[PDB]
Design a protein around this ligand. Sequence first.
Ligand SMILES: CNC(=O)C[C@@]1(C(=O)Nc2cncc3ccccc23)CCOc2ccc(Cl)cc21
Ligand SMILES: CNC(=O)C[C@@]1(C(=O)Nc2cncc3ccccc23)CCOc2ccc(Cl)cc21
Lengths: 301, 305
Amino acid sequence: SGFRKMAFPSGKVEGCMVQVTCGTTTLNGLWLDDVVYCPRHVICTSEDMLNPNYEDLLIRKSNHNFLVQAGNVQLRVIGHSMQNCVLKLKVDTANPKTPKYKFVRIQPGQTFSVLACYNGSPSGVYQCAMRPNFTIKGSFLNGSCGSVGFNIDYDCVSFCYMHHMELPTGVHAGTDLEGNFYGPFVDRQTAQAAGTDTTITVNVLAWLYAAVINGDRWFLNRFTTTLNDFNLVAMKYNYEPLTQDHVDILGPLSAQTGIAVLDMCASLKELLQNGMNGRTILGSALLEDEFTPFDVVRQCS
Amino acid sequence: SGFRKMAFPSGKVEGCMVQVTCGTTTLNGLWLDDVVYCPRHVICTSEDMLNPNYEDLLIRKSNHNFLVQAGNVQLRVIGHSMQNCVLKLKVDTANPKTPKYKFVRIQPGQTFSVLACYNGSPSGVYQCAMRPNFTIKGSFLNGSCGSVGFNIDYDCVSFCYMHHMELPTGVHAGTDLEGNFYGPFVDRQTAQAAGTDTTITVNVLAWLYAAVINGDRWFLNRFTTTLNDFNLVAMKYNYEPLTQDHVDILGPLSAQTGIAVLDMCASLKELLQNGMNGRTILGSALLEDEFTPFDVVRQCSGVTF
Ligand SMILES: CNC(=O)C[C@@]1(C(=O)Nc2cncc3ccccc23)CCOc2ccc(Cl)cc21
Ligand SMILES: CNC(=O)C[C@@]1(C(=O)Nc2cncc3ccccc23)CCOc2ccc(Cl)cc21
């Protein structure tokens, strides 16, 4: 029993965190095999942040301009290339702590663990979700760029995120490990705004199923709804539309608890209308949307 | 910016998790140097658990009865002893991944990271606080016994908890690494109940300081209070008393934000008597009490491990 926001054990990722310095800028890099991945903005100076020409800035750099530190050992850079917004620094040593890994690009609503690092040193681990506006509500200070988001599949690390920037609202934007930004963001200091965020409806429903599995049933009702009627109500509370895919994904939890997805959807409509009335669901007074249906099943079964 | 419930990096602890099997029972063990620590109830059957004589059960066991697995390598047990509610299995091999570590007993209100394990394999890491009723509101399934709680100080792991049981309300009870239970709990199948819980006042104040640091200021007010007037109000809402030690501990956050502790206490007092009024603090509609003042400083300054 019990339900917690739970991150994956970060050990496999900790052994890949290195410090990458280029001039006066220092951020984190991910050392996998003989390659160190880091945000390409590490090559930017003061007047290269509004409109950097990364191809032009990178051509002017040599391997000896990149100082890579793995623990108290300086790694030697033997090559450099750029793939979208990620810089790849070929080093002269394969990381002996390289786990089995994959680079996976995730979709909004997907959760992952973040290993927050400063100066190539891991300081904390927390669980995040990719918001529907493609930002993450992380916890990052200056120097956290290059900190990564990941999931663990048995013994395989799926790297899904690398931190690049903080938007004016305090939310964070980054890329997958191929340098492709999540969202319409660019790695420039030009005026950028996170779109209006919405609630990840499928995740809230998955979390209501977690609550039912844990014995919290007060919010349940005798109602069901059509998918269309649910979405009309949901949109009014800034909730993401629930697709038939989401309904299918909730199938196992629906079967386990004996509460049809559209039946749980009617509970959600009611909760949105009434609020909680001083009650909590899994120790929370708000509807939690950072647990996917996969997370709920993994944590409960 | 941003404020998250954040655990310590679990890598130093992951290298210590092993699987301990005794008969039909399989749980987790902590392999440090040449010793594997695990809950002593691993030696119990179902009948034994009802009224266990652990000294009697342990004397009947031999070293070969304990199957210890570190990855896909079976460790050979060369000795066994019991220290309170923890079993210590002496093994022939010192764990090469043994970090710098200490066994520390924590106080209620103190937080720590839990590395949830099943079959000696770490599956998740989460942060939590030792509740004032000595339970932890963890997330544990069958097979999680032996999962440990820890903090990291510099490069030293301080092991503070080992999971032993789940109470009927779904809350968890366990021991320090010397086998001493936190709370009035015993390791036996019998009627046990978690006491009425209280809110960790110093932690709520620390979290209000984290909210101020992050730009959430709506709850701040012009008022201040005496420590005694605050504690009279706090006791009424099942909040732990705030000591002068707690006020001193909040000193750095008080200086950083320019809000005196008793000034923040009057904000908390109003939040208790009046509520949030539909507003949130750090995305939460409830007062968060699982961030200590040290956790807030560490997260709002970026201390690394
Ligand atoms: C020195 N340069 C930087 O720090 C990179 C920077 C950035 O957002 N860094 C940070 C990321 N996360 C948390 C932060 C908390 C506080 C301050 C900085 C933080 C800051 C300057 O504007 C941009 C614009 C585009 C891009 Cl891709 C990166 C950046
Ligand atoms: C096989 N026996 C056990 O697992 C030990 C057991 C226990 O609480 N295990 C669990 C601990 N945490 C999460 C659990 C989730 C579900 C089920 C079991 C869980 C279960 C039997 O009663 C007791 C009584 C005292 C003590 Cl010290 C241990 C126990």
